[PDB]
Amino acid sequence: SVVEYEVVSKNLTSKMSHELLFSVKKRWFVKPFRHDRQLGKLHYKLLPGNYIKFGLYVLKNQDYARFEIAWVHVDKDGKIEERTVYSIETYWHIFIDIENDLNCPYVLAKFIEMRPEFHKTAWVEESNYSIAEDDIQMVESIKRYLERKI
Ligand code: NI
Ligand code: NI
């Protein structure tokens, strides 16, 4: 009882759109079944449950970065419903520097760091690691963090 879903992963000369799915249950990012470079898209095969889609849209030359957090809900009929639960606009040079922020949410640090290379998709490692926090605390800490950073 599986379902397929599509996020955008592309780093172009002018802009970058980087979305990745984080599993609520496994408390770490999801391995995509297929990375599509020709069109800048990843492909996931998701089991019924909840996951979270982090999004990072960047207009390089306008120093612009927006970061979104959306909640992805997959029920039994294989049906899919989405709602943004957070969205924030800010300069990109700030965003990129968040990687180096010693004390700052890890998954956020990880996310930014997994952005896709030029003309390519990103890709998720076969990891077994999980983070201490649960979906709620995780999102809050992230929110709470960027707030101060901004
Ligand atoms: Ni439901
Ligand atoms: Ni909140």
From Swiss-Prot:
InterPro entries to which the protein is assigned, alphabetical: DUF3258
Pfam families: DUF3258
Gene3D superfamilies: 2.60.40.2930
Name of the protein: Uncharacterized protein ORF157
Organism expressing this protein natively: Acidianus filamentous virus 1 (isolate United States/Yellowstone) (AFV-1)
